[PDB]
Design a protein around this nucleic acid. Structure first.
Ligand code: IHP
Ligand code: MG
Ligand code: MG
Ligand code: MG
Ligand code: MG
Ligand code: MG
Ligand code: ZN
Lengths: 34, 46, 287, 49, 222
RNA sequence: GUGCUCGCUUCGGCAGCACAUAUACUAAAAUUGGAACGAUACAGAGAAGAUUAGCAUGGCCCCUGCGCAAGGAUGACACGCAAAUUCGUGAAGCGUU
RNA sequence: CGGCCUCCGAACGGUAAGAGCCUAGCAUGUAGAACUG
């Protein structure tokens, strides 16, 4: 029972996740740090 | 087009009295009179 | 669904059956909600059928999702239930029925897809009454079309392609005419079911005698392929027998019993159907 | 051995069924057992405090 | 046909949509009908876009029926596109149209004040309708997904039903004080009157809440 | 049905080869059942003395709206209020005399 | 050698709410269909 109604806000948007890069603070450097 | 519904404060028209008084955003008018479509329809059915 | 649930009659004859599927095709008049619809080509120039009840609405009472009759016997559900002495509490009103259907699907979700839920197994003692009212061959008149109302007034000008059997229409004065599908499913006053009741009431069964001390039972139509120990093994562990007279000058028998209810069990279950080595014996209480 | 075919859905077809049906919520679960410490009734003094 | 089916499926017998796509009532409508028969920017934006295309098609029908002319057809088309403002009345349903309407005026100015460079007169004999045609076509490029979404939702709500069951409405500007109090007095009822009781009986939470509201009135009155 | 057999073999057919391969909610119907917010009429408007603004909570109530916005008499309904509770009634049960 | 020229309109908020009542529509187009010695 899945309706066909819909929303302006549920349109696709921000569809890639920004992954935390090498310089910012990756879980790797958190693995290291003192 | 034809601008169909005139603005006839129906409380006034039927009972001579509108609770809003001066601010009634409609036309204080007790005049019975054949409308813009009544006559058309009756004549064509005639 | 995986596929429908219907009897052989509704199911078809050709080895290769052709049925088209539509997901969420229409509304089970029982579960009231969307179901899948599989549509099967019944027979040559025979009306294409379609699945007509939710598969859960089916596993509820264990009947045919198209043919509407039980899947083991194949008699009206009122009948089959009563032949198991079965008494279902299925709710009827709108809100009550929706709540019932919802929790029913929840409870059936915990099943393995093999057999109907609930008393449908604890009533599985299919009584010889049901066995005997059960039809034998595929009454395949079901897949013949309607009465081509044109062809009933004359009008069916499409040649032989009248979409419906151009015969004489049944006088709806017959109780076998207007049985509302919902009522037939609810076991609600099915006149065809009352006809099956009258038939299984008039159908021959063994008669009881008057005095308790008539514990001699005459079995008519024996023949000379029978033994006294074979008459025994017919009526021996079904209680205790006291004596037996195998009348070979009249081709009958007479079991004097040691338990009256045991005699009743053996004989009444044996009425015309105690078929050992193929001879139609008649179980009665002797003189 | 049976051939299933999927029947076309018509594109210009509105929804078919009244979805918005309200009923109460179904009965919950088999209640858990209350594995509580021994509970103490309070003095009437405490009660008035 | 589509729009009439919509009305008459909604059971609005007292309204009738005529052939230039004006909606006109055939009675005097009571309140309940005045209200039940209201329509929104989806319905009216289609109505008026259909009216624009019908005016275009019917200028072409006049020409091919043979009444007018090639030149009269071109000038009429130029008119229609420049004057969309006073033929249709779409601006009232998407007031962002006046982007387009100002664009067609500006074109109208450019084309004309270069068109009459010589003896040519400042009168009706100018149909050069490439530009406004472009304009309204881009407007349509944009409006088709919007209207598809709005009309899908209108139809869905028409055939399934409106879901008043799981709405979950935001807290906007008029429910800010009401909501602060829902949650203040919920928090109280969680907070002590059920997690520092030992008033075993029935913890009189309904009365500790009455204190709380009188403590507030007394703070406010000093 | 279309062609070709070096087919009989005449220009009649017969035949063989090839090629060509499974439509369809069968129905012009006949049914069968509910609403039209329309008449009809009855009805007949929150809080505090009067006259009135609203915003919410609850849910087998919805309506208009694209709407998670807004409106529909604050949309309607919510109405006994139970409730313990203050004294005694009693019964059950454990312990003392 | 100088050129500088905003705007523009529709809806809700406004002419109660109701139960009954009665009848078009609008939907359905289905399922089935009988037996013996
Ligand atoms: O109604 P509009 O589309 O805005 O245009 C008309 C008109 O032209 P159209 O009626 O044929 O479009 C005039 O232009 P002429 O035909 O007289 O050349 C006039 O121009 P002026 O005002 O400069 O005299 C002006 O059009 P424009 O936008 O070019 O001014 C006027 O509309 P407005 O006077 O409101 O602009
Ligand atoms: Mg008051
Ligand atoms: Mg509101
Ligand atoms: Mg008000
Ligand atoms: Mg108001
Ligand atoms: Mg409210
Ligand atoms: Zn007034």
């Amino acid at each position: 029972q899945l309706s066909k109604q819909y929303s302006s806000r549920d349109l696709p948007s921000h569809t890639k996740i920004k992954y935390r890069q090498t310089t910012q603070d990756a879980p790797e450097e958190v693995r290291n740090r003192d | 087009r034809w601008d169909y519904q005139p603005d006839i404060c129906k409380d006034y028209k039927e009972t001579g009295f509108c609770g809003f008084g001066d601010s009634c955003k409609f036309l204080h008018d007790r005049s019975d009179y054949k409308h813009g479509w009544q006559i058309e329809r009756e004549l064509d059915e005639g | 669904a995986d596929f429908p649930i219907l009897c052989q009659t509704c199911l078809g004859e050709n080895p290769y059956i052709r049925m088209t599927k539509e997901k969420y095709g229409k509304e089970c008049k029982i579960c009231a909600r969307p179901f899948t619809v599989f549509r099967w080509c019944p027979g040559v120039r025979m009306r294409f059928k379609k699945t007509e009840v939710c598969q859960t609405c089916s596993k509820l009472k264990n009947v045919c999702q198209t043919c509407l009759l039980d899947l083991e016997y194949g008699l009206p559900i009122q009948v089959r239930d009563a032949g198991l002495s079965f008494k279902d509490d299925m709710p009827k009103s709108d809100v009550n029925k929706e709540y019932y259907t919802q929790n029913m699907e929840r409870e059936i979700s915990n099943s393995d897809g093999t057999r109907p839920v609930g008393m449908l197994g604890k009533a599985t003692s299919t009584s010889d009454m049901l066995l005997k009212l059960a039809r034998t061959t595929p009454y395949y008149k079901r897949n013949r079309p309607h009465i081509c109302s044109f062809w009933v007034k004359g009008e069916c000008k499409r040649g032989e392609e009248c979409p419906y059997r151009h015969e004489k229409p049944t006088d709806p004065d017959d109780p076998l005419a207007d049985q509302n599908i919902k009522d037939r499913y609810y076991g609600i006053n099915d006149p065809v079911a009352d006809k099956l009741l009258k038939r299984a009431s008039t159908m021959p069964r063994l008669d009881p005698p008057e005095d308790k001390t008539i514990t001699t039972l005459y079995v008519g139509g024996l023949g000379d392929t029978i033994t006294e120990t074979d008459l025994r093994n017919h009526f021996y562990q079904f209680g205790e027998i006291r004596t037996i007279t195998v009348v070979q000058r009249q081709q009958c028998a007479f079991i004097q019993f040691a338990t009256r209810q045991a005699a009743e069990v053996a004989a009444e279950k044996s009425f015309n159907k105690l078929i050992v080595n193929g001879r139609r014996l008649n179980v009665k209480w002797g003189r | 051995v049976i051939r299933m075919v999927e029947m076309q859905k018509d594109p210009m077809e509105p929804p078919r069924f009244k979805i918005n049906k309200k009923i109460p919520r179904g009965p919950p679960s088999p209640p858990a057992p209350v594995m509580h410490s021994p509970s103490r009734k309070m003095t009437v003094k405490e009660q008035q405090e | 046909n589509m729009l009439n089916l919509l009305i008459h499926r909604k059971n609005l017998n007292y309204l009738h949509l005529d052939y230039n796509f004006n909606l006109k009532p055939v009675k005097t409508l009571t309140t309940k009908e005045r209200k039940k028969s209201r329509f929104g920017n989806a319905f009216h934006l289609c109505r008026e876009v259909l009216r624009l295309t019908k005016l275009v098609v019917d200028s072409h029908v006049q020409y091919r029926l043979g009444n007018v002319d090639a030149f009269q057809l071109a000038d009429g088309l130029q008119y229609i596109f420049a004057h969309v403002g006073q033929l249709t009345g779409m601006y009232r349903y998407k007031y962002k149209l006046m982007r387009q309407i100002r664009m067609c005026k500006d074109l109208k100015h450019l084309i004309y004040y270069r068109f009459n460079t010589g003896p040519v007169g400042k009168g009706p004999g100018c149909g050069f309708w490439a530009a406004g045609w472009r304009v309204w076509l881009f407007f349509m490029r944009g409006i088709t997904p919007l209207l598809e979404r709005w009309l899908g939702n209108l139809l869905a709500r028409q055939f399934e039903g409106r879901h008043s069951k799981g709405v979950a409405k935001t807290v906007t500007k008029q429910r800010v004080e009401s909501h602060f109090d829902l949650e203040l007095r919920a928090a109280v009822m969680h907070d002590i009157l059920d997690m520092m009781p030992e008033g075993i009986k029935q913890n009189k939470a309904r009365t500790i809440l009455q204190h709380l509201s009188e403590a507030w009135r007394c703070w406010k009155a000093n």
